[PDB]
Symmetry: C3
Subunit: 254 residues, 3 copies
């Protein structure tokens, strides 16, 4: 049987809210390592890779490798019935007819139980595992989100140029051009201002802002975000869940 | 000068109207020596809204004649959106009037607002005066009941309320799946705003429309507590204590 | 060359947001005195007069008289990229193809540059000098906003009656009639409820509520608003910018 209990439902609520606009029907692959998700955007441009590690659940039990086909639209509606501080418990039997979601309140003696009907979904192989990147940028997710939404007002595409002197986010449209330059800064001793850049080679790539702004819906999950760049491979946008991660892969248009 | 009613806080009338405006549009305000009452049926004649504002909540209160005041609630909300919650509300009227006067006085600033709302002629006729005998009576936090309705409303348009000797269960099923919230009889002892009381003579299981219940829960601002009265062969009663007196919602079960 | 540096971008953000729904294409007239704007509403009824004095900028440079044709919709998109506490710097040369907007952040230390394409708008105006008003009403901007929005629900027209003892806002529509009377009172203990009236003569005038509610989009600029009334001249609604003003002129309905 499967059982995973989150002290605060807030985590799962926000993770689903970050993916719901890209993927709708996808599998939640469960084993002793935790709950993982790998699904491609409906337009086959972006890939979403999520991992919820077993050490983030208390307790966590998974007797069998199991695939749970779940509509994310169905799940978000149910998860909006849970408050952020509610005790969330996900349960399942040795058969995938339905998934059980239990919402316990720490204060009020109120118990909420939901049974979501499962679906039959087949997963992809899927590429790609572990690419070595030419540039790695760790910056505040809140800052990265504002940069994306701001430039999205001027154009539908953004140019990311990463050199040894910093990272430049370029943009141009009918209205005009837009530019955001962040400098590599370390040991501010105030971690909300830190930007680290590991660079093996300069990179200049163009991406869709429509996807990046969707990626930035995971800003509530982590204060930090990691951008991994190289041509011939998709952009990697990773968010730290603490005990796990949420990764976004996005193919370049350049 | 026939009718005069003064409310300490305009918030009360603001919240009552805001809870009903989406159900009833045209209705009568029945006024006599006892106070101001409203009894109106949903536009689809499924739900009944019953309000009673007793005269002891007004200072002063004057009503020379039993009178019915036909008032459009849309018009009334626009006027009531001009009143702050802590304004002194004064409702005035002449003998058998064309319009009703609403005066909003500010306790702080030297600001006075006066409005004259044109009346309409609406007939109700009958009417009971029910005195229903219920099999189960549930007193629970209104904030909790509102969340239960709105949460289950996401999965389906229909809800099953089961009240037994061991508690009350709100059950639901839809295309997505099933949902259930069970509340236990609880007493505090610690925080009495979380208390749940159940008076039960016999178990009851009825099905109701969540679309109406969610609308009923717009009265959550009126009381921290809500009372659910259930019995077979009769509609659900959802009552809110206004503090002399009450706001009631009646909803027929779905066969 | 033109250079103007605002300590807080919030001011320009709010000013544009106050005018954007009346005027969209207009010139920003710049000289050594400062940056001024004078444009008429699209329906050719209301006149908007803005002045940003040079003493409000640090630093401020303008070598030659220049007009900057700017779409407010485009500018709003760009100014929504600036945080309220960002250092805003407006730069342009004499021969203007475009205007450069620089957003420096005091916190995240992020620099944003935008190049907004200018438009060709021809300059012209009407004289408006030391007009003598019969009644001057200083009241809370928030209350004036509340009064207009409330009465606008009942009617399209408002009657403003100003005496030495206070101001009455009258209204009548299909639903019924509405009236708000405020008394001239001052009480430093609460400067947000104070109403002062400078009156040489009683005034009773009728105005369009649709324009007044738009004027009240400048409420974010000042806690106070000034109403200047007279039967022989249009209504003046002024908001103090601190270093200058934003003026709305509205003709009475005879």
């Amino acid at each position: 049987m499967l059982e995973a209990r989150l002290e605060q439902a807030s985590l799962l609520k926000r993770v689903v809210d970050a993916i719901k606009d890209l993927v709708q029907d996808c599998n939640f692959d469960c084993n002793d390592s935790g709950i993982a998700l790998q699904a491609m955007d409906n337009s086959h441009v972006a890939l979403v890779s999520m991992l919820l590690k077993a050490e983030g659940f208390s307790p966590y039990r998974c007797d069998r490798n199991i695939a749970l086909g779940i509509n994310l639209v169905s799940l978000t509606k149910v998860l909006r019935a849970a408050q952020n501080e509610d005790i969330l418990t996900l349960k399942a039997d040795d058969s995938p007819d339905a998934v059980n979601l239990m919402f316990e309140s720490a204060e009020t003696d109120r118990i909420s139980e939901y049974d979501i009907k499962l679906m039959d979904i087949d997963q992809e192989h899927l590429a790609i595992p572990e690419t070595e990147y030419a540039a790695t940028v760790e910056m505040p997710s809140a800052e990265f989100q504002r940069i994306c939404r701001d430039l999205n007002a001027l154009s539908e595409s953004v140019v990311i140029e990463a050199t040894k002197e910093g990272v430049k986010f370029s943009c141009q449209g009918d209205i005009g051009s837009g530019s955001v330059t962040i400098r590599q800064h370390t040991s501010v001793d105030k971690p909300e201002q830190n930007v680290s850049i590991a660079l093996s080679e300069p990179v200049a790539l163009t991406f869709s802002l429509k996807y990046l702004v969707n990626f930035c819906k995971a800003t509530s999950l982590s204060s930090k975000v990691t951008l991994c760049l190289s041509q011939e491979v998709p952009l990697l946008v990773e968010y730290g869940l603490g005990s796990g991660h949420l990764r976004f892969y996005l193919a370049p248009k350049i």
